[PDB]
């Protein structure tokens, strides 16, 4: 049965947040580990990150927020809408007011590339409540300021201007 | 340059936490999606999860929390120490007090498998500050209890009791 | 006095082997009897097994093979080393070539669970030659594959996956 | 199913004999270990003896020799008859011919105490082919010659002459 008590629900939510942060940290660590002269430490980081993923997935299953995909896409849609509409403009304005180049640059890379996720998820949801799988192939992603390019791939990234060969393909 | 003003630091930390949460949720949704009649939805889910990972990595680099591998391993060591000493025992006792099965089960799985991660990180670190890479191969992770097996893999899982065929190989 | 003539020594060794086999058979028969509606036949079997043990001990001592604890531990070390290094691998290979699943299973359990006994005996000998006893409590033995667990007990059996409750405890 | 191939059967029989002998050897060693300033090595000895008992039981069942209670009692009857009628008289005669006092003493103690088991087993088998149990209680065993005394125990040992309080009781 789903967890109903408030205090333990808060405890499990905080544990899930910590596990997600740890998994992100390990995934980031592995990239620099393989950039140096240690190709095995990256393997260790990847394995431990997968262990953290398993922990966080168990915590997510316990709280009971995961179900059928047609209703599951709505949470992603709402999260993307919140990230693009409200949270990011305020952070960009605050970073402009305080005057940090790095924060402004990162927020600018963020809000301009997060716009397509909501549209893609809405299309996927309205095409996937009848029992059929959507027709999509070769989703491309920029490795610096990831811009979800669908099917075809632009020669240069409109946001950062990276060359096409750097795109990480998914198939 | 690292962010020094307090408000921008808080905002970027919150953004990093949100992006990590988004990545983990998208990964879980992808794993559920591939388990049913829609194969191509998981591709989109994993692509957008990679995009969230890129955003989180940019936010993490913005706060300048990344250094060389010797110092990188210290953060993991401290995180594992805190996860296995302070948080999980208290959460398990609270879940026992309130009397719910799922939280106790998940915390029981979690607290019995995080003791080896600190030892692995310490072993990697002592070999990393000298200039060489450790030797490791065939790392197994249980997909129903997160249990790190080094090199040899037991026939049955000493935590959940799953056969050695169910494990996942990270080579 | 100890027996020195050859044929007397051969006869005593054969008698020792016969008494040991009879004691094992009576123990197995008693264990089977307890699993039925005859609880007193098990008592008779246990008493007669103890009598066979007394006869076997007399035969063994008459050969002059009982010494202080160091030499007994050394003899156990040699026996365990021979059991794990030479006999069981060849027996398992021959059984697998012939094609009987029960023989392969039994020999697999025997050569997987007999590896610690030698290390325990050598540690005990190292701690029991100066003049002191070895600190150890609450040993665990599996009832379906003979798995030794010292002090702590794993949640599950790494060899057969038998639950924790089924472990027999010696203290 | 039963093992039918010849060489696998031979290897299983040899392993059964070896495990039984090792179990008896460690049972013998435990009593001397606890009779010294090392009262905890007996715990290890008994735990390893139980593990070898499990291994020997596995080998015994692999051969398919365990059956219902009447068949087990018949096997015990045959074994005891062979042990008393043919083996021990010849062993005693050979020991007397060669001239060893210890072997003669041991065989003398054995052949004058093993004569009471066959009738006990015959009575138990006669009373066990009727769903009912035999009616015995408080079996006494001598510690230095294995004298099986049923119910009432003599004040002294008719074979060696040890007092009654040295007997071990099973009830
Ligand atoms: Fe963790
Ligand atoms: Fe997004
Ligand atoms: Fe770009
Ligand atoms: Fe996002
Ligand atoms: Fe961890
Ligand atoms: Fe497991
Ligand atoms: Fe007997
Ligand atoms: Fe006998
Ligand atoms: Fe052994
Ligand atoms: Fe087992
Ligand atoms: Fe053995
Ligand atoms: Fe006696």
XYZ file of C-alpha atoms and ligand atoms in Angstrom:
696
model
C 0.000 0.000 0.000
C 1.074 3.590 -0.640
C 2.644 5.514 2.233
C 0.063 7.670 4.015
C 1.784 9.040 7.133
C 3.012 12.596 6.621
C 6.333 12.521 8.487
C 7.623 9.342 6.852
C 6.400 10.627 3.479
C 8.567 13.713 4.001
C 11.465 11.476 5.045
C 11.143 9.371 1.886
C 10.872 12.479 -0.308
C 14.067 13.904 1.188
C 15.800 10.537 0.735
C 14.707 10.454 -2.912
C 16.085 13.964 -3.417
C 19.402 12.983 -1.855
C 19.678 9.844 -3.977
C 18.979 11.818 -7.159
C 21.606 14.410 -6.229
C 24.133 11.661 -5.467
C 23.431 9.917 -8.781
C 23.896 13.186 -10.679
C 27.136 13.866 -8.802
C 28.518 10.412 -9.608
C 27.558 10.713 -13.283
C 29.348 14.074 -13.425
C 32.392 12.633 -11.634
C 32.701 9.755 -14.107
C 33.012 12.094 -17.102
C 36.025 13.864 -15.598
C 37.452 10.536 -14.411
C 37.479 9.212 -17.978
C 38.879 12.555 -19.191
C 42.076 11.926 -17.204
C 44.141 8.705 -17.254
C 41.760 6.549 -15.188
C 39.294 4.618 -17.429
C 38.383 2.165 -14.640
C 37.390 4.742 -12.014
C 34.773 5.924 -14.514
C 33.429 2.359 -14.589
C 33.256 2.322 -10.787
C 31.432 5.667 -10.781
C 28.938 4.425 -13.384
C 28.208 1.268 -11.388
C 27.746 3.178 -8.130
C 25.511 5.685 -9.928
C 23.348 2.804 -11.145
C 23.157 1.561 -7.552
C 21.964 5.009 -6.456
C 19.436 4.900 -9.304
C 18.089 1.595 -7.978
C 17.806 3.080 -4.478
C 15.951 6.153 -5.737
C 13.660 4.014 -7.901
C 12.720 1.915 -4.876
C 11.991 5.095 -2.912
C 9.858 6.399 -5.794
C 7.915 3.126 -6.000
C 7.274 3.191 -2.249
C 5.616 6.621 -2.375
C 3.373 5.475 -5.226
C 3.729 8.273 -7.800
C 4.517 5.898 -10.788
C 1.665 4.389 -12.901
C 0.432 4.054 -16.477
C 2.229 6.081 -19.143
C -0.830 8.066 -20.406
C -1.223 9.616 -16.953
C 2.536 9.448 -16.316
C 3.331 11.925 -19.100
C 1.286 14.602 -17.309
C 3.811 14.926 -14.474
C 6.597 15.517 -16.986
C 4.448 18.035 -18.857
C 3.740 19.963 -15.649
C 7.387 19.879 -14.588
C 8.557 21.209 -17.949
C 5.904 23.938 -17.911
C 6.936 25.024 -14.412
C 10.632 25.037 -15.335
C 10.190 27.085 -18.512
C 7.456 29.523 -17.485
C 8.110 30.532 -13.867
C 11.339 29.292 -12.276
C 13.871 30.164 -14.970
C 12.928 33.775 -15.873
C 13.089 34.729 -12.184
C 16.525 33.147 -11.756
C 17.760 34.860 -14.923
C 16.498 38.234 -13.683
C 18.091 37.716 -10.261
C 21.434 36.686 -11.774
C 21.318 39.729 -14.056
C 20.607 41.960 -11.048
C 23.468 40.535 -8.975
C 25.808 40.456 -11.980
C 27.331 36.999 -12.472
C 28.354 36.062 -16.008
C 28.259 32.308 -15.380
C 24.786 32.169 -13.823
C 23.280 34.386 -16.530
C 24.924 32.326 -19.279
C 23.749 29.031 -17.775
C 20.179 30.262 -17.281
C 20.127 31.636 -20.839
C 21.256 28.252 -22.153
C 18.590 26.657 -19.952
C 15.366 28.554 -20.790
C 16.015 28.678 -24.545
C 16.417 24.887 -24.879
C 13.759 23.615 -22.437
C 10.817 24.860 -24.527
C 10.424 21.828 -26.811
C 10.030 19.202 -24.071
C 6.479 20.247 -23.173
C 5.346 20.217 -26.810
C 6.942 16.819 -27.449
C 5.368 15.332 -24.321
C 1.938 16.775 -25.146
C 2.108 15.289 -28.647
C 3.251 11.948 -27.222
C 0.416 11.911 -24.682
C -2.322 12.819 -27.157
C -0.967 10.192 -29.571
C -0.558 7.550 -26.815
C -3.931 7.031 -25.035
C -5.259 4.607 -27.705
C -2.703 1.802 -27.552
C -0.302 2.801 -30.348
C 3.350 3.806 -30.075
C 4.452 7.094 -31.625
C 6.602 7.207 -34.763
C 9.897 8.941 -33.855
C 13.511 8.187 -34.861
C 17.013 9.576 -34.281
C 16.526 12.184 -31.574
C 19.589 14.447 -31.476
C 20.996 16.384 -28.519
C 23.692 19.030 -28.196
C 26.390 18.045 -25.659
C 26.920 21.577 -24.262
C 23.472 23.221 -23.946
C 21.336 20.282 -24.964
C 18.737 21.210 -27.567
C 16.403 18.314 -28.363
C 16.582 18.090 -32.142
C 14.049 15.615 -33.529
C 14.780 13.382 -36.534
C 16.797 15.736 -38.732
C 19.885 17.449 -37.328
C 20.817 21.102 -37.971
C 24.319 21.793 -39.247
C 25.039 24.094 -36.290
C 23.304 24.519 -32.950
C 21.146 27.686 -33.074
C 21.895 28.422 -29.400
C 25.654 27.855 -29.048
C 26.859 27.239 -32.609
C 28.446 23.844 -32.000
C 29.235 21.705 -35.064
C 26.917 18.879 -36.046
C 29.418 16.080 -35.374
C 29.297 16.779 -31.619
C 25.601 15.873 -31.313
C 24.899 12.796 -29.191
C 22.521 10.584 -31.174
C 19.840 8.354 -29.621
C 18.470 5.337 -31.486
C 34.638 32.155 -11.655
C 32.688 30.496 -8.848
C 29.495 32.199 -7.695
C 30.104 34.138 -4.475
C 26.868 36.028 -3.779
C 24.520 34.082 -1.523
C 21.201 34.452 -3.361
C 22.588 33.287 -6.709
C 24.208 30.349 -4.910
C 20.860 29.358 -3.386
C 19.059 29.690 -6.719
C 21.635 27.609 -8.597
C 21.608 24.906 -5.911
C 17.814 24.701 -6.133
C 18.053 24.496 -9.929
C 20.584 21.657 -9.677
C 18.325 19.737 -7.288
C 15.347 20.215 -9.598
C 17.274 19.039 -12.655
C 18.482 15.927 -10.819
C 14.906 15.146 -9.765
C 13.749 15.590 -13.361
C 16.461 13.267 -14.680
C 15.626 10.515 -12.190
C 11.880 10.773 -12.824
C 12.419 10.636 -16.585
C 14.647 7.570 -16.227
C 12.004 5.745 -14.177
C 9.286 6.718 -16.659
C 11.444 5.409 -19.517
C 11.991 2.078 -17.763
C 8.238 1.720 -17.263
C 7.517 2.763 -20.861
C 9.856 0.166 -22.368
C 8.108 -2.487 -20.235
C 4.880 -2.128 -22.250
C 3.600 -1.915 -25.828
C 5.273 1.419 -26.671
C 9.019 1.027 -27.397
C 9.708 4.414 -28.993
C 8.409 6.501 -26.073
C 11.346 5.327 -23.947
C 13.733 6.743 -26.560
C 12.222 10.215 -26.162
C 12.201 9.840 -22.375
C 15.887 8.896 -22.283
C 16.823 11.694 -24.698
C 15.099 14.340 -22.589
C 16.643 12.762 -19.478
C 20.057 13.256 -21.085
C 19.095 16.879 -21.737
C 18.222 17.318 -18.052
C 21.571 15.736 -17.174
C 23.352 18.281 -19.378
C 21.496 21.134 -17.672
C 22.343 19.763 -14.219
C 26.003 19.382 -15.193
C 26.114 22.989 -16.392
C 24.587 24.159 -13.104
C 27.062 22.032 -11.123
C 30.055 23.434 -13.021
C 28.678 26.955 -12.508
C 29.074 26.637 -8.705
C 32.637 25.323 -9.290
C 32.209 22.167 -7.199
C 34.382 20.064 -9.537
C 38.093 19.399 -9.118
C 40.597 16.649 -9.846
C 39.765 13.008 -9.166
C 41.683 12.866 -5.806
C 39.530 15.669 -4.405
C 36.501 14.442 -6.370
C 36.502 11.148 -4.455
C 36.403 12.955 -1.092
C 32.907 14.307 -1.767
C 31.674 10.799 -2.539
C 33.361 9.449 0.592
C 31.669 12.059 2.790
C 28.309 11.548 1.080
C 28.428 7.788 1.594
C 29.521 8.236 5.219
C 26.590 10.557 5.925
C 24.168 8.293 4.049
C 25.208 5.174 5.974
C 25.764 6.670 9.451
C 23.170 9.388 10.138
C 20.274 9.473 7.672
C 19.195 5.905 6.955
C 19.229 4.474 10.529
C 17.049 7.351 11.752
C 14.697 7.044 8.778
C 14.415 3.287 9.339
C 13.615 3.754 13.030
C 10.993 6.394 12.221
C 9.395 4.093 9.640
C 9.389 1.284 12.208
C 7.711 3.574 14.753
C 4.982 4.730 12.370
C 4.462 1.153 11.167
C 4.489 0.994 7.364
C 5.936 -1.928 5.421
C 7.178 -0.236 2.241
C 9.337 2.427 3.900
C 10.907 -0.099 6.279
C 11.622 -2.475 3.387
C 13.217 0.209 1.206
C 15.333 1.603 4.047
C 16.382 -1.926 5.032
C 17.567 -2.581 1.483
C 19.298 0.803 1.343
C 21.212 0.815 4.683
C 22.703 -2.681 4.253
C 24.335 -2.009 0.860
C 25.976 1.429 1.232
C 28.826 0.302 3.512
C 30.998 -1.020 0.669
C 30.828 2.189 -1.384
C 32.950 4.138 1.105
C 35.570 1.375 1.134
C 35.633 1.283 -2.674
C 36.052 5.062 -2.873
C 38.828 5.049 -0.263
C 40.643 2.253 -2.104
C 40.364 4.179 -5.374
C 41.565 7.399 -3.725
C 44.695 5.912 -2.135
C 45.674 4.670 -5.610
C 44.668 7.931 -7.334
C 46.852 10.485 -5.517
C 49.983 8.599 -6.634
C 49.263 8.722 -10.384
C 47.942 5.279 -11.433
C 44.561 3.661 -12.047
C 43.071 0.774 -10.085
C 42.359 -2.625 -11.635
C 38.723 -3.750 -11.707
C 36.437 -5.671 -14.053
C 32.956 -7.246 -14.157
C 31.141 -5.125 -11.587
C 27.661 -6.514 -10.887
C 24.729 -4.504 -9.516
C 21.524 -6.080 -8.253
C 18.442 -4.610 -10.000
C 16.141 -5.055 -6.941
C 18.271 -3.944 -3.912
C 21.305 -2.078 -5.340
C 24.123 -4.290 -4.110
C 27.639 -3.702 -5.426
C 29.441 -6.948 -6.275
C 33.137 -6.628 -7.149
C 34.634 -9.074 -9.723
C 33.109 -12.338 -8.496
C 29.326 -12.452 -8.164
C 27.551 -14.679 -5.610
C 25.158 -17.317 -6.907
C 22.269 -15.796 -4.932
C 21.855 -12.265 -3.618
C 22.643 -12.044 0.128
C 20.053 -9.251 0.543
C 16.978 -10.078 -1.564
C 17.759 -13.632 -2.675
C 17.792 -13.093 -6.436
C 19.701 -15.473 -8.736
C 23.026 -14.353 -10.284
C 21.398 -14.396 -13.721
C 19.325 -11.291 -12.876
C 22.332 -9.026 -12.233
C 23.595 -6.362 -14.644
C 27.216 -6.276 -15.811
C 29.264 -3.060 -15.842
C 32.553 -3.756 -17.626
C 50.320 -48.786 24.299
C 49.788 -47.697 20.697
C 49.412 -50.423 18.081
C 52.490 -50.938 15.903
C 51.792 -54.152 13.977
C 50.559 -53.545 10.445
C 47.473 -55.766 10.273
C 46.213 -54.635 13.677
C 46.529 -51.019 12.492
C 44.658 -51.847 9.264
C 41.863 -53.610 11.157
C 41.534 -50.712 13.605
C 41.360 -48.189 10.751
C 38.663 -50.223 8.994
C 36.723 -50.502 12.260
C 36.984 -46.731 12.750
C 35.621 -46.124 9.252
C 32.767 -48.563 9.848
C 31.829 -46.998 13.183
C 31.871 -43.503 11.668
C 29.637 -44.586 8.783
C 27.250 -46.317 11.198
C 27.051 -43.188 13.365
C 26.283 -41.031 10.324
C 23.608 -43.468 9.138
C 21.970 -43.507 12.570
C 21.969 -39.703 12.730
C 20.305 -39.503 9.304
C 17.759 -42.164 10.279
C 16.909 -40.310 13.500
C 16.462 -37.046 11.597
C 14.117 -38.801 9.166
C 12.222 -40.409 12.059
C 11.556 -37.057 13.744
C 9.830 -35.992 10.499
C 7.170 -38.685 11.052
C 4.847 -39.869 13.807
C 7.480 -41.835 15.748
C 9.390 -39.527 18.145
C 10.807 -42.276 20.386
C 12.465 -44.245 17.574
C 14.511 -41.078 17.052
C 15.564 -41.221 20.715
C 16.655 -44.840 20.286
C 18.585 -43.922 17.135
C 20.335 -41.029 18.889
C 21.347 -43.175 21.871
C 22.707 -45.940 19.642
C 24.515 -43.309 17.552
C 26.178 -42.064 20.737
C 27.215 -45.647 21.510
C 28.736 -45.948 18.028
C 30.532 -42.652 18.670
C 32.021 -44.058 21.881
C 33.238 -47.143 20.016
C 34.712 -44.979 17.246
C 36.493 -42.784 19.796
C 37.965 -45.875 21.459
C 39.191 -47.146 18.083
C 40.644 -43.734 17.190
C 42.456 -43.263 20.510
C 43.798 -46.833 20.419
C 45.700 -45.812 17.270
C 47.456 -42.990 19.139
C 46.150 -40.243 16.845
C 44.822 -37.878 19.577
C 47.193 -35.041 20.548
C 46.990 -31.529 21.961
C 44.921 -28.856 20.234
C 47.699 -27.552 17.888
C 48.278 -30.955 16.265
C 44.543 -31.660 16.024
C 44.015 -28.298 14.322
C 46.895 -29.080 11.954
C 45.289 -32.419 11.063
C 41.992 -30.650 10.419
C 43.846 -28.125 8.257
C 45.387 -30.880 6.139
C 42.059 -32.679 5.796
C 40.199 -29.533 4.755
C 42.931 -28.543 2.292
C 42.809 -31.978 0.662
C 39.001 -31.887 0.558
C 38.832 -28.483 -1.128
C 41.865 -28.588 -3.444
C 41.928 -32.113 -4.923
C 38.864 -34.299 -4.323
C 35.810 -32.146 -5.002
C 36.955 -30.460 -8.271
C 37.678 -33.847 -9.872
C 34.476 -35.363 -8.490
C 32.460 -32.449 -9.891
C 34.153 -32.715 -13.291
C 33.492 -36.462 -13.491
C 29.872 -36.026 -12.390
C 29.312 -33.293 -14.980
C 30.847 -35.462 -17.705
C 28.632 -38.409 -16.743
C 25.530 -36.208 -16.639
C 23.782 -36.472 -13.266
C 22.329 -33.221 -11.953
C 22.144 -34.351 -8.316
C 25.831 -35.288 -8.136
C 26.834 -31.995 -9.764
C 24.609 -30.052 -7.355
C 25.965 -31.826 -4.270
C 29.599 -31.471 -5.336
C 29.031 -27.818 -6.277
C 27.660 -27.074 -2.812
C 30.503 -29.031 -1.202
C 33.262 -27.230 -3.105
C 31.596 -23.823 -2.692
C 30.861 -23.981 1.055
C 34.005 -25.760 2.333
C 36.462 -22.947 1.545
C 36.275 -21.065 4.900
C 36.861 -24.003 7.248
C 40.597 -24.016 6.507
C 40.948 -20.283 7.153
C 38.979 -20.596 10.403
C 41.146 -23.510 11.553
C 44.412 -21.742 10.738
C 43.257 -18.565 12.504
C 42.259 -20.651 15.532
C 45.648 -22.389 15.506
C 47.464 -19.046 15.309
C 45.428 -17.740 18.251
C 45.671 -21.069 20.197
C 49.415 -21.888 20.207
C 50.527 -19.085 22.591
C 48.154 -20.178 25.387
C 44.875 -18.289 24.918
C 41.414 -18.901 23.472
C 39.959 -17.287 20.342
C 37.116 -14.792 20.796
C 34.166 -16.059 18.734
C 30.422 -16.374 19.338
C 27.214 -17.436 17.594
C 28.304 -19.465 14.579
C 25.705 -20.148 11.872
C 25.295 -23.229 9.664
C 22.888 -23.591 6.725
C 20.672 -26.726 6.768
C 20.567 -27.334 2.956
C 24.152 -26.652 1.725
C 26.417 -26.416 4.778
C 27.324 -22.674 4.638
C 29.475 -21.428 7.563
C 28.747 -17.947 8.936
C 30.937 -16.699 11.820
C 29.673 -14.093 14.384
C 27.333 -12.259 11.947
C 24.807 -14.008 9.706
C 23.951 -12.917 6.143
C 20.315 -12.095 5.460
C 20.124 -14.827 2.803
C 22.180 -17.801 1.676
C 24.615 -16.754 -1.087
C 24.754 -20.372 -2.308
C 21.127 -21.570 -2.275
C 19.074 -18.559 -1.166
C 17.660 -20.123 1.989
C 16.051 -17.501 4.267
C 17.802 -16.342 7.419
C 15.434 -18.086 9.859
C 16.502 -21.537 8.591
C 20.103 -21.111 9.776
C 21.026 -23.246 12.776
C 22.939 -21.417 15.488
C 25.789 -22.770 17.613
C 26.758 -20.952 20.809
C 16.335 -39.962 -8.929
C 18.958 -42.522 -7.919
C 22.445 -42.297 -9.417
C 22.905 -45.288 -11.718
C 26.308 -44.718 -13.341
C 29.082 -46.747 -11.735
C 31.922 -44.236 -11.385
C 29.690 -41.449 -10.071
C 28.306 -43.895 -7.502
C 31.838 -44.871 -6.457
C 32.877 -41.231 -6.071
C 29.730 -40.421 -4.080
C 30.352 -43.381 -1.761
C 33.960 -42.292 -1.218
C 32.857 -38.720 -0.483
C 30.230 -40.001 1.966
C 32.838 -42.073 3.810
C 35.257 -39.142 3.913
C 32.674 -36.681 5.221
C 31.493 -39.147 7.875
C 35.069 -39.743 9.032
C 35.777 -35.997 9.148
C 32.596 -35.360 11.148
C 33.571 -38.057 13.644
C 37.114 -36.667 13.846
C 35.919 -33.157 14.670
C 33.403 -34.523 17.182
C 36.326 -36.290 18.868
C 38.468 -33.142 18.746
C 35.739 -30.974 20.297
C 35.647 -32.933 23.563
C 39.403 -32.508 24.017
C 39.225 -28.836 23.015
C 36.616 -28.112 25.693
C 38.584 -30.218 28.217
C 41.385 -27.619 28.162
C 41.855 -23.884 28.615
C 40.243 -23.294 25.206
C 36.480 -23.725 25.705
C 35.464 -21.872 22.513
C 37.335 -23.911 19.882
C 34.783 -26.625 20.674
C 32.128 -24.321 19.204
C 34.030 -24.174 15.907
C 34.607 -27.930 15.984
C 30.914 -28.682 16.512
C 29.757 -26.163 13.891
C 32.114 -27.629 11.287
C 30.997 -31.120 12.337
C 27.399 -30.098 11.642
C 28.416 -28.662 8.260
C 30.104 -31.937 7.318
C 27.004 -33.760 8.562
C 24.957 -31.689 6.108
C 27.375 -32.538 3.289
C 27.304 -36.250 4.156
C 23.502 -36.182 4.320
C 23.389 -34.568 0.877
C 25.645 -37.290 -0.532
C 23.573 -39.983 1.214
C 20.288 -38.707 -0.231
C 21.920 -38.358 -3.660
C 22.494 -42.124 -3.604
C 18.815 -42.658 -2.786
C 19.392 -44.804 0.305
C 16.917 -43.068 2.639
C 13.507 -44.715 2.874
C 10.613 -45.265 5.258
C 11.179 -46.232 8.883
C 10.814 -50.055 8.512
C 13.439 -50.109 5.749
C 15.815 -47.953 7.798
C 15.368 -50.284 10.772
C 15.996 -53.323 8.556
C 19.195 -51.723 7.246
C 20.299 -51.037 10.815
C 19.525 -54.646 11.746
C 21.643 -55.974 8.879
C 24.511 -53.622 9.697
C 24.489 -54.536 13.387
C 24.305 -58.260 12.598
C 27.320 -58.000 10.296
C 29.188 -55.874 12.847
C 28.688 -58.323 15.711
C 28.667 -61.794 14.125
C 31.583 -61.638 11.663
C 33.789 -58.559 12.057
C 34.576 -58.145 15.751
C 35.292 -61.817 16.663
C 37.859 -62.030 13.855
C 39.374 -58.660 14.764
C 39.685 -59.737 18.408
C 41.238 -63.073 17.434
C 43.777 -61.343 15.182
C 44.630 -58.780 17.872
C 45.132 -61.560 20.424
C 47.333 -63.447 17.951
C 49.534 -60.416 17.281
C 49.692 -59.426 20.946
C 48.445 -55.852 21.365
C 46.659 -55.134 24.638
C 44.915 -51.955 23.464
C 43.285 -53.541 20.405
C 42.189 -56.569 22.436
C 40.711 -54.291 25.109
C 38.859 -52.189 22.532
C 37.417 -55.192 20.689
C 36.481 -56.827 24.003
C 34.574 -53.706 25.035
C 32.931 -53.516 21.606
C 31.741 -57.103 21.155
C 30.218 -57.370 24.646
C 28.229 -54.131 24.229
C 27.101 -54.354 20.579
C 25.005 -57.490 21.183
C 21.990 -55.577 22.551
C 21.253 -53.365 19.521
C 19.884 -56.030 17.158
C 16.974 -57.056 19.384
C 16.120 -53.416 20.124
C 15.934 -52.714 16.393
C 13.883 -55.863 15.750
C 11.392 -54.882 18.460
C 11.206 -51.325 17.112
C 10.563 -52.603 13.581
C 7.879 -55.009 14.806
C 6.166 -52.175 16.696
C 6.661 -49.702 13.773
C 4.813 -51.483 10.916
C 1.571 -50.407 12.703
C 1.621 -46.556 12.627
C 2.502 -46.745 16.320
C 5.756 -45.995 18.138
C 7.881 -48.095 20.462
C 7.594 -47.328 24.189
C 11.054 -46.622 25.619
C 12.330 -43.855 27.916
C 15.558 -42.588 29.504
C 18.207 -44.589 27.665
C 21.533 -44.750 29.518
C 24.894 -44.982 27.736
C 28.261 -45.761 29.336
C 30.988 -43.190 28.524
C 33.959 -45.629 28.337
C 32.510 -48.760 26.578
C 29.111 -47.811 25.096
C 26.693 -50.051 27.081
C 23.104 -49.506 25.944
C 20.855 -49.873 28.999
C 17.097 -49.575 28.472
C 14.953 -47.798 31.104
C 16.443 -49.035 34.382
C 20.195 -48.518 34.703
C 22.470 -50.856 36.701
C 24.315 -49.412 39.679
C 27.641 -50.352 38.063
C 28.754 -51.232 34.554
C 28.689 -55.024 34.014
C 31.421 -54.659 31.300
C 33.957 -52.118 32.760
C 32.597 -51.261 36.270
C 32.166 -47.487 36.003
C 29.697 -46.003 38.522
C 26.168 -45.112 37.493
C 26.578 -41.324 37.665
C 29.032 -41.418 34.735
C 26.263 -42.597 32.391
C 24.786 -40.188 29.849
C 20.982 -40.093 29.711
C 18.804 -39.568 26.634
C 15.130 -38.791 27.218
Fe 22.643 6.698 -1.339
Fe 13.150 19.635 -19.530
Fe 24.033 23.831 -28.353
Fe 14.017 20.323 -17.800
Fe 25.518 5.706 -2.173
Fe 19.481 -8.270 -4.346
Fe 24.951 -49.360 15.960
Fe 27.616 -50.905 16.271
Fe 34.958 -30.215 5.422
Fe 22.194 -22.702 1.818
Fe 34.464 -32.013 4.484
Fe 31.408 -49.429 30.871
